[PDB]
Every structure is written in structure tokens, then in C-alpha cells.
Design a binder for this molecule. Structure first.
Ligand SMILES: CC(C)c1cc(Nc2nc(N3CCC[C@H](N)C3)ncc2C(N)=O)cc(C(C)C)n1
Length: 271
């Protein structure tokens, strides 16, 4: 299944860096043979010393599985000193940019986005993957199209982080469900639920649906968010429980244009 390369540059022309990490870089690459674009995750094998085999076994599972709402793993190249995970390039644009650029945006739009994220995350959890890094930067549109799905653009083999992680307590898949709750909060008002003391507010899950920003938001949406942004990970909704909530599965999401306020808050609260 793994392709071998003496030099990855025989296969790909590398262009702009999309993301950097601990001994991992995602770069825009053109396949020389075809002209097709990809997002290539470049990993030094030295950084995988001890776990190489386990990570390869897990890559070997995921290369066979495409989720509608997750970046596809298209190929894996092995050079003498690197692994290259050739990922689907998700090119439709960024999450907050779309909302700001739209003239019209409703709770049903936010609910449609969260439903897709819950589907993707439920799948990762079944495969034994805790994402741990769910935030708007990892959510990109497939296409510039009106009807484009959203996709988790990247995953690994403070304001978005669960209280139990900040508490240095044991944590589980539930940390992702907290992050989806925080993203849902921002999608409905345009600002983060925690900011200052900040650490203490997250630790105590101290947030509010403050006026006027939350006045025209449904009680159902507020209840949905309360069930995900729940301090106790045992009490917190799973992805499965969230996907059954009427705001996702039913018809409680409102059809009021809340674009003006959400777009103003996104512009004011982010760089
Ligand atoms: C936001 C910007 C850096 C960006 C990201 C793009 N794609 C991806 N980006 C990234 N990263 C950057 C965001 C955070 C993430 N952990 C790493 N990773 C994957 C993709 C992808 N699958 O296309 C594609 C594009 C364009 C070139 C289509 N721009």
C-alpha cells in the first residue's frame, strides 16, 4: 500500500506551506505526472521512532475509508527518512470567511454545519481517534458552491479545550464534544464563550447567552449548546446524543437572518 520514493521531489512540486506543527508540515503540492493538487503532510520518520509501526498500521486502516466530511488520505509515500501523507486538498474556503461573505445566515445554516461535524467526529471516535484540536481553522469547505459541505481538513493519527484537559485530569473522546459545543456557540453569535481568570472560567464552564446577541436565538439552540458545553464529561452529550437533539435532527432551528450581528461580532472578536 505504501509507495516508495528515493526523493519526494520526483513525485511532487511543493508550493506554499498550509500548516506547521511538532515535526510535521502540511504543504500544497502538485503531482508532477498529472497536475493534480494535494495537501501533503511531511513527517520525519525520526519523530516516529518507537511508534512507526503502530502509526503505519493506523494509516493503513484510514487509507481505505472516505468520510464525506473528512479530508481523504489519497496515498502514502515513504522516502528513506520521511513519510508523506497525501491528503485531499480542501479548496472551497474558510468557515468564518463564508459566513462574513454571505448576505444571509440562519440557525438552520449553523445546525447544518454542526450536523456535518458531528457525523465526521462520531466516525473518528468509532475508529478510536480523539481529534483533540477541533476549531474553525480545521473546518474548510469542499467547494465555493452555495451547497458545499464542510470538512475536517486535518487530524492527528485553550478557548476550545475541555475543562478536564485544562485540569490535567484523565480525558476521553468527550473533549471533542465540548469543542463542537464551543464552535456551535461561535456560529450562533460570532464571539467565543470564554475570554478574560479565563482558565478558571473554562474550568468552571462559566459562560452566558448574553443579550442582545442571544435574544433572537431559539431556546432549542441554547439547550443544544448547554448539553455539549457541560463541565462533567460523564453528563456531557456524546456526538450520537447531540445528533439526535431536535436542533440537529428536528425542526427547532430557526430561519431568521442573524447574519448582521454574527458577521459584526466575527469581524470585531477575531484578528
Ligand atoms: C487556511 C489556509 C492555510 C489553507 C488551508 C488549506 N488546506 C488545508 N490546510 C491544512 N492546514 C492548515 C489549517 C490547519 C490545519 N491543521 C493544517 N491542512 C489540510 C488542508 C487540506 N486538507 O487541504 C487550503 C488552502 C488553499 C490553498 C486551498 N488554504
Amino acid at each position: 500500500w505504501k509507495k516508495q520514493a528515493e526523493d519526494i521531489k520526483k513525485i511532487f512540486e511543493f508550493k506554499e506551506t498550509l500548516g506547521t506543527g511538532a515535526f510535521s508540515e502540511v504543504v500544497l503540492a502538485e503531482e508532477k505526472a498529472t497536475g493534480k493538487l494535494f495537501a501533503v503532510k511531511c513527517i520525519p520518520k525520526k519523530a516516529l521512532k518507537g511508534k512507526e509501526s503502530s502509526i503505519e498500521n493506523e494509516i493503513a486502516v484510514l487509507r481505505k475509508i472516505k468520510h464525506e466530511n473528512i479530508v481523504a488520505l489519497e496515498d502514502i509515500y515513504e522516502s528513506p527518512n520521511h513519510l508523506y501523507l497525501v491528503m485531499q486538498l480542501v479548496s472551497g474556503g474558510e468557515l468564518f470567511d463564508r459566513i462574513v461573505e454571505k448576505g444571509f445566515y440562519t440557525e438552520k445554516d449553523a445546525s447544518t454545519l454542526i450536523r456535518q461535524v458531528l457525523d465526521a467526529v462520531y466516525y473518528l471516535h468509532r475508529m478510536g481517534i480523539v481529534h483533540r484540536d477541533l476549531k474553525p481553522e480545521n473546518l474548510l469547505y469542499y467547494s465555493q458552491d452555495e451547497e458545499s459541505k464542510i470538512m475536517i481538513s486535518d487530524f492527528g493519527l485553550p478557548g476550545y479545550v475541555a475543562p478536564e484537559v485544562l485540569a490535567q485530569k484523565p480525558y476521553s473522546k468527550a473533549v471533542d464534544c465540548w469543542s463542537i459545543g464551543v464552535i456551535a456557540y461561535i456560529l450562533l453569535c460570532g464571539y467565543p464563550p470564554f475570554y478574560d481568570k479565563l482558565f478558571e472560567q473554562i474550568l468552571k464552564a462559566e459562560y452566558e447567552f448574553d443579550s442582545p446577541y442571544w435574544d433572537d436565538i431559539s431556546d432549542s439552540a441554547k439547550d443544544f449548546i448547554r448539553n455539549l458545553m457541560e463541565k462533567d464529561p460523564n453528563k456531557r452529550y456524546t456526538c450520537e446524543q447531540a445528533a439526535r437533539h431536535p436542533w440537529i435532527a428536528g425542526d427547532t432551528a430557526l430561519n431568521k437572518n442573524i447574519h448582521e450581528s454574527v458577521s459584526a461580532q466575527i469581524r470585531k472578536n477575531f484578528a
